[PDB]
């Protein structure tokens, strides 16, 4: 129920006009039983220690809903991002990564941060370049230290739509559940980085040649009936399936992993309200279900 | 032929009534040419150094039969497990993990232990929590340090039936061979842990939508012949195949990996008795075949 | 444009008749933005620092063409391999691995060397055994420290044909592009080593049973039309597809990954000459395309 | 002025009657500019985060007074030590060491804890055995991870009197200054542990034979004047000096290092009130002097 | 005779007006038989690879003259320091430290750099803060990573006069020899940092009380002759000796270590020209003597 | 009473005529409570596991007698050294170091081996170069990995006479005690290596100038009595004391540390037979005394 580890920080920065400023930041890790911990960084004046603690507990229970094997974590850095040039926002981000890293609050097997509304993919690149260039130079998994990175830096396709797409797939099955599409795809991104290759890379051509052989096999079976030469035409794929094969990419595998996730989590939550026999409240069912797993 | 490394140990425990006891234990690693080494822990009074050495050699040759890229290892701890409360059995296990760990006799790239009849999955959880909480906190692969864990801790589906199921698949092809189904699935568990995701997780929904497109493609090919609207029905899967798609899980992939393993090992052993032309003895063929690879 | 890191070396060896010899060697790493770096070792008298620097830049741009996420690297050791017995060629190789390793110029997350015409797979085994037995004993990825190894040591199937096969697939789509088939398969080998299992190992039996179910499903769909018992025979695969299923191995997956690679790189290079609208020169298009990505 | 790092913790313990209890603890590190950080652990119900933060700042300024090159740190564990058997007090201490260690809040180059009134030398042994047996097994400096240990475990002679003795030497020169005798001797203990040998061990016999030669040399100089055989007797040491030589131990060197420390710090504080020309207030002089150095 | 390792580098910096600049740098390590290597960093346009190689060989032979157990090393960064603001000179220095560190060309057990005419103590602080804050945070010896630091950062007293003072002591005994006073004191600084305490810190008060006891002992020996009470006064020290005891500091121990060094090296060089019987050339004697030891 | 860890090994070597040989070796560590462990390596056919175990227990108790803070250890390699050329004896030694190193049976904070009658200082150099060049390249303490090295490699002066000299000093005070002079000086060698400077290096000139000032101070005290100019001559040292000052080296400090050791151990053993009041048996007194400390 409480957080295993909460790291409060203060670090100095040179403001861009030469002024001196102390930056205060936090990261709470919740359940070390599940490693790595996973969670976003918020830049706001409103960030307090108890907020990140509250959000790291909720992240644990959200990861458990969708069977993402991460512990909960949350960070916040008390700044108003609109008052800082992008110069210093690099320094604030870079140094904050550095102070968490020394203390074991960031790493691919330890704690994997994510963006928030206040935090973008460019802050993810800085966090990733920081770790990769100091603590994690020799680590092969260093580019799994953070998720929400841009494609060129190890990001993943289908991340923009992930939460909106998961809300959709969550309902079609029918906050702790519908909102877990971003958590799920961040897990896929972390896996992709650990895999060092994109999904399907080796499998697409193999599959498509297997799909051809099966339609080609159905002809020579139907032609052993009625005498022809390529005369009956099972050989051909349909229109939406040919544009499936010629377009198959990483984001297709991310879509199906996310759909299979939101599908399987919805049947467990229903089974959770088929045991206590809760009513139409799916909230308490999801928490009962998440706490059950944790 | 002999063991590269044999670690003999003695460590004190406080007995549960306050008594003092020295616990004696062993782990033999056989071939360091193949890393990690892999093998079970026995709790028996009968465990001797030469026993674990004998069983670590045999494990090397058994892993080579089925093309499991592990070296052989074996451990034993000289205790009668029935004389100890589960309290101290935790301490004996935990400390024994700790003393092997310091010396490089346990780790996911080093040596991966397994249970025996005397050793269960709860001892695997203790070994895993011990390593993960001391030596392996920052290691991303720390939960691959041991196999035979429970599903909630990183175990694998289809482990209960693995040896019985492999005996079956080994014969249908037709001790060092038939008994390797547990060795094979422990390898799959170790891979699963290294993968950090369960098998099929991302692939099931993608495959099932590919399977639908192919039956849907065979209609619109047969309907371009005879004029209809969805009138001829290739669209539908058969009864055992629909319960394949709607039920596909990790243990289905474990089953097929194990079957493909026992199948491929049986054809190599037959080819091994098609070279020397041994007779119906498949034993010496399997050893010739294992020593050949090692 | 220049190399981030160039390591010049000198190390003594005892010649095989007792003489004393200083061996001079180099490794240039090009872009640390992309890790690990990847490149071959040349044994020649002609090897100079500026040569390996030139070839490490070109390797970066060649890896970027085919979307192999490696930085460029190159090594050379100034010796005429024909003047040394295989005894000392082991020592020269082994010690050179050792001096690069101490300095972070060889490792699976750092720098992954490959053979050249002057360098074989036996030198890869020595490099791999050296790293695995000193620096990388506890590293789980130590056998990814080098590519071009023999199958028994972690090599990959389809490496002999990789460059010749990629030249072919590169043209059928229509030096920096056609020559990247070896670079691509070395990436697949590195991935295989990081995966610790061969490609398809778990997937072949599963796929083949899925392929059977689909042809078996097309019968019971065509037999729900015309009354029979197994009378119409979609069940059967064609002749080249049955020898696909019964023969499916790792090299089939390597072939398709390589074809999918050379296919996707050719469409990007064409799109690169559909933007500037270069003419039939595909060279400058490939460099524009590689520099674009880097 | 604020603390660089504050680690808040919660960890479960099994109470000695089987009950379940969450233990809350803190460690604040103040100035990372000076490493390692140094400070005590308090067991009290009164321990709060702001208390340990306040006491870690003061410890920084106290170490700077006496030129002890440590940063400030403080820990507290919110428990009433009188409600726990020594059994669980071992577990609370041991696990708290373990959770700080994973996060880089305990170590000989990182953070070196000390006792308090609530914390004894037996808790120091547990902290030291914990670190030495998990995180620090291969660290040569692992027994410098904590100070205030018992002599048999690496403690130091003259620690019991250190603070009382420093109060004395501080006044004879004439809270932040007089109280620094324990801080100073803990630094000497940390040095002793880093030295791996006790003070004087190699120097006592050498010095005493040098002292003999000098008195023996003064004879043969006075006897070259007046004719004798060993007749005039400079040879002999005085009574308090002979019991100096025959008794010289580590605590004699600790005494003089502490006296030389309290002596040199008093002249700097006086010089600090000879610059601003503060009056008889030596407090503000000591803070001006400590902040000056930091 | 040649250098074991030469690291050539290029790294980008943002110029202070926004321009982009590639900075080229080198470090040659000479004899790895002696670790750590030791040598200065030059900032000049004139720095070439063969220059730093030449100066790293000479540094090896200079360290061997005075029995400083360091290997030779040298660095240079090709820039004109007068064209850069101190802002970017921090970045050039900081990043250059970072690129050497990743490759094992800077560290307290590896390679310890020093200043030159072009390089000051503020560049030493940046190098030291860089290492201590990235690679060496947990290293207890991280502040030994570089010498020539300022006293507040771990510098040593008597460094300003070291070379001028060694030239003096070298002659009073009577380039590779007379110039080794800075090399010798840098070794003392490195030792001081490894000791974590300044020289004499614990020994001054102890010695002075031993010196008092000996003069006090000579009285009570001369007073056992002629009857008095404190009447004859051996008790008192002379004028230059009392200002020795009341002033004794670290730089007194550095002076004597340096004098004892230049004294012992001069007698070995003379003995080197008493074996070949070279003439008044002390140069070739010093090289014969240095090569002899190496 | 038993050994905490016993490592049995087998490793292949190529015999010098091309033959193949498996070499069997052992190292027993006794008490991990005291780290590092310390003990010699024997090359004999007679070496058995129980022998090295017996000798590692005795080494623990011998180190405790003389207050050398090492645990006991012992190694043996079953070979007749007279049947091997020095070529292969390098390989046997080098590889045996390598296999112990991987397993944490050799290191400066772990286990520090020593020679035996069968093992020399050249085997110590090989062990040291092996560790320093693989496992311990970046370790600053790597040259403390072994004792009994030659002076040029980090050996210590006064090691040849250490055991004979300790037998002498042990008796002058009046097997487990008299034989501990080699154990004591090996501890001094290990300390010297950890210190990275030889004993007295910085202290000799300082001391000698302090000794001069004291004799010079006794004049100006005796001359304030009787009117002279340098007329009375306390200034001069005696004949054995001047050859003390002009000859003072490391072996003088080793002598006095060893004498102070054998002196202090003899008074504890006498006090051990003044408590039980054993008779003239000093054996059982020494064991009672050693077991008391352990």
Cross-chain residue pair D103–A99, CB shorter than 8 Å = no
E98 in A contact zone (CB under 8 Å): yes
Structure token pair of residue C204: 């072949």
Q: Which residue of F has its CA nearest to B23?
A: F4
Rounded to the nearest 5 degrees, what angle is found at the Cα of B259, between the Cα atoms of B253 and B261?
100
Query: What are the angstrom distances between the C-alpha of D271 and each of C142, D265, D276, D277, D293?
Result: 61, 10, 9, 9, 14
User: By C-alpha distance, which of E258, E239, E294, E266 is closest to E57?
Assistant: E294
Residue linked to tokens 């890393």? B35
CA distance B135 to D134: 7
- Which of D35, D187, D294 should be substituted to probe chain E, the one whose Cβ sees the most E Cβ atoms within 10 Å? D35
CA distance C75 to C43: 9
Q: What is the largest CA-CA distance in chain B?
A: 88
Confirm if E54 and E39 have CB atoms less than 8 A apart: no
Q: Identify the burial level of F11 via C-beta atoms within 10 angstroms of its C-beta, where 0-12 means exposed, 13-18 middle and 19 or more buried.
A: buried
CA distance E288 to E276: 9
* Count of beta carbons in the 10 Å neighbourhood of residue B1: 9
Q: How was this structure determined?
A: cryo-EM
Chain F: partners with 3+ C-beta pairs within 8 Å: B, C, D, E
Question: C-alpha F94: how far from its chain's center?
Answer: 22
Distance from CA of B132 to the nearest CA of A (A): 9
Query: How many residues appear in chain B?
Result: 294
Residue linked to tokens 């004894």? D120
Confirm if A52 and A27 have CB atoms less than 8 A apart: yes
Helix axes C49-65, C181-195, angle to 10 degrees: 80
Confirm if C123 and C89 have CB atoms less than 8 A apart: yes
Chain F residues whose beta carbon lies within 8 Å of the beta carbon of residue D209: 256
CA distance D71 to D187: 12
Query: What are the angstrom distances between the C-alpha of F29 and each of A76, D154, F61, F72, F191?
Result: 49, 21, 13, 6, 20
Structure token pair of residue A154: 């190890």
* Count of beta carbons in the 10 Å neighbourhood of residue B85: 11
Query: How many residues appear in chain E?
Result: 294
Cross-chain residue pair E9–C4, CB shorter than 8 Å = yes
CA distance E114 to E144: 11
Q: What residues pair up with C22 in beta bridges, in sequence order?
A: C12
Helix axes F86-102, F121-133, angle to 10 degrees: 50
Cross-chain residue pair C218–A218, CB shorter than 8 Å = yes
Confirm if C194 and A196 have CB atoms less than 8 A apart: yes
A291 in C contact zone (CB under 8 Å): no
Give the H/E segment covering residue A77.
strand A71-78
User: By C-alpha distance, which of E102, F217, F271 is closest to C102?
Assistant: E102
CA distance F136 to F129: 9
Give the H/E segment covering residue A21.
strand A20-29
CA distance F198 to F191: 10
Query: What are the angstrom distances between the C-alpha of A116 and each of A43, A74, A86, A131, F13?
Result: 8, 10, 17, 19, 60
Cross-chain residue pair A256–B220, CB shorter than 8 Å = no
Helix (H, G, I), strand (E, B) or coil at B286: helix
Q: Which of E38, E53, E62, E74 is catalytic?
A: E74
A137 in E contact zone (CB under 8 Å): yes
User: By C-alpha distance, which of D189, D207, D191 is closest to D247?
Assistant: D207
Which residues 6+ apart lie within 8 Å of C239 measured at CB? none
B102 in F contact zone (CB under 8 Å): yes
The two beta strands, E37-44 and E111-114, are parallel
Chain F residues whose beta carbon lies within 8 Å of the beta carbon of residue B102: 104
CA distance B196 to B192: 6
Chain F residues whose beta carbon lies within 8 Å of the beta carbon of residue B52: none
User: By C-alpha distance, which of E185, E187, E128 is closest to E159?
Assistant: E185
Which residues 6+ apart lie within 8 Å of C151 measured at CB? C157
Buried/exposed code over D224-245 (b: 16+ C-beta within 10 A; e: otherwise): eeeeeeeebebeebbeebeebb
CA distance C248 to C158: 13
> What residues of A are annotated to the active site?
74
Kindly tell me the sign of the dihedral angle through the C-alpha atoms of E160, E166, E168, E169: positive
CA distance F37 to F72: 5
Cross-chain residue pair B217–A199, CB shorter than 8 Å = no
User: By C-alpha distance, which of D197, D120, D109 is closest to D154?
Assistant: D197
Confirm if E132 and E145 have CB atoms less than 8 A apart: yes
Distance from CA of A107 to the nearest CA of C (A): 15
Note the resolution in Å, 1 decimal: 1.8
Confirm if D234 and F246 have CB atoms less than 8 A apart: no
The beta strand positions in F50-199, using DSSP E, are 71-78, 111-114
Distance from CA of F255 to the nearest CA of D (A): 8
F134 in C contact zone (CB under 8 Å): yes
> DSSP letter string over D77-130?
EE--GGGS-HHHHHHHHHHHHHHHHHTTSSBTTTEEEE--SS--HHHHHHHHHH
Q: Which residue of D has its CA nearest to E219?
A: D234
Helix (H, G, I), strand (E, B) or coil at A29: strand
Cross-chain residue pair C103–E105, CB shorter than 8 Å = yes
A10 in D contact zone (CB under 8 Å): yes
Structure token pair of residue C235: 């069940």
* Count of beta carbons in the 10 Å neighbourhood of residue B71: 27
Distance linking the first and last C-alpha atoms of chain A: 10
φ/ψ (deg, to 5) at B23 = -105, 130
Residues in F 250-269 with any Cβ partner in D closer than 8 A: 252-254, 256-257, 259-260, 263
Strands across the sheet containing B71-78: B111-114, B37-44, B71-78, B20-29, B5-14, F5-14, F20-29, F71-78, F37-44, F111-114
Query: What are the angstrom distances between the C-alpha of F234 and each of C85, D218, D283, F230?
Result: 74, 5, 49, 9
Structure token pair of residue B173: 């092809």
Which residues 6+ apart lie within 8 Å of E6 measured at CB? C7, C8, C9, E26, E27, E28, E29, E49, E52, E53
Helix (H, G, I), strand (E, B) or coil at D46: coil
Rg, Å, chain A Cα set: 23
Distance linking the first and last C-alpha atoms of chain B: 10
Chain D residues whose beta carbon lies within 8 Å of the beta carbon of residue B102: 137
User: By C-alpha distance, which of F155, F158, F246, F254 is closest to E267?
Assistant: F246
Confirm if B93 and B131 have CB atoms less than 8 A apart: no
CA distance B199 to A105: 29
Structure token pair of residue A37: 């911990």
> What residues of B are annotated to the active site?
74
User: By C-alpha distance, which of A250, A283, A264 is closest to A68?
Assistant: A264
Q: Which of F38, F74, F149, F251 is catalytic?
A: F74
CB-side neighbour CA atoms (13 Å) of C158: 26
CA distance C258 to C181: 7
Helices (H) and strands (E) counted in chain F, each on its own, are: 9, 5
CA distance C87 to C181: 32
- Which of F3, F6, F72, F101 should be substituted to probe chain B, the one whose Cβ sees the most B Cβ atoms within 10 Å? F6
Helix (H, G, I), strand (E, B) or coil at C114: strand
CB pairs under 8 A between A and B: 84
User: By C-alpha distance, which of B48, B99, B101 is closest to B76?
Assistant: B48
Chain B: partners with 3+ C-beta pairs within 8 Å: A, C, D, F
Q: What is the largest CA-CA distance in chain D?
A: 88
- Chains A+F touching (3+ CB pairs under 8 Å): no
* Count of beta carbons in the 10 Å neighbourhood of residue E159: 23
* Count of beta carbons in the 10 Å neighbourhood of residue C242: 14
């Amino acid at each position: 129920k409480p957080c295993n580890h909460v790291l409060s920080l203060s670090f100095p920065i040179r403001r861009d006009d030469g002024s001196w400023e102390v930056i205060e930041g936090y990261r709470a890790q919740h359940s070390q039983h599940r490693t790595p911990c996973k969670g976003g960084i918020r830049y706001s004046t409103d960030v307090s220690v108890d907020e990140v603690k509250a959000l790291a507990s909720l992240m644990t229970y959200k990861c458990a809903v969708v069977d993402v094997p991460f512990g909960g974590a949350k960070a916040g850095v008390k700044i108003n991002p609109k008052n800082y040039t992008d110069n210093e926002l690099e320094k604030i981000t870079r140094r904050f990564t550095m102070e968490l890293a020394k203390k074991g609050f960031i790493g691919p097997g330890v704690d994997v941060p994510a963006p928030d509304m206040s935090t973008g993919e460019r802050e993810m690149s800085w966090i990733a370049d920081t770790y990769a260039s100091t603590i994690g130079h020799y680590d092969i998994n260093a580019h799994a230290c953070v998720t929400g990175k841009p494609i060129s830096q190890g990001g993943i396709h289908g991340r923009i739509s992930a939460t909106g797409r998961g809300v959709f797939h969550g309902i079609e099955n029918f906050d702790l559940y519908l909102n877990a599409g971003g958590v799920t795809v961040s897990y896929f991104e972390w896996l992709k980085n650990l895999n060092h290759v994109s999904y399907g890379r080796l499998t697409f051509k193999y599959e498509r040649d297997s799909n051809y052989h099966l339609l080609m096999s159905v002809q020579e079976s139907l032609e052993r009936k009625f005498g022809k030469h390529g005369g009956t035409i099972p050989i051909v794929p349909t229109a939406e399936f040919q544009d499936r094969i010629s377009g198959a990419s990483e984001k297709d595998i991310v879509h199906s992993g996310l759909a299979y996730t939101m599908e399987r989590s919805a049947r467990q939550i229903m089974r959770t309200a088929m045991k206590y026999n809760l009513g139409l409240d799916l909230r308490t069912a999801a928490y009962v279900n998440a706490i059950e797993k944790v």
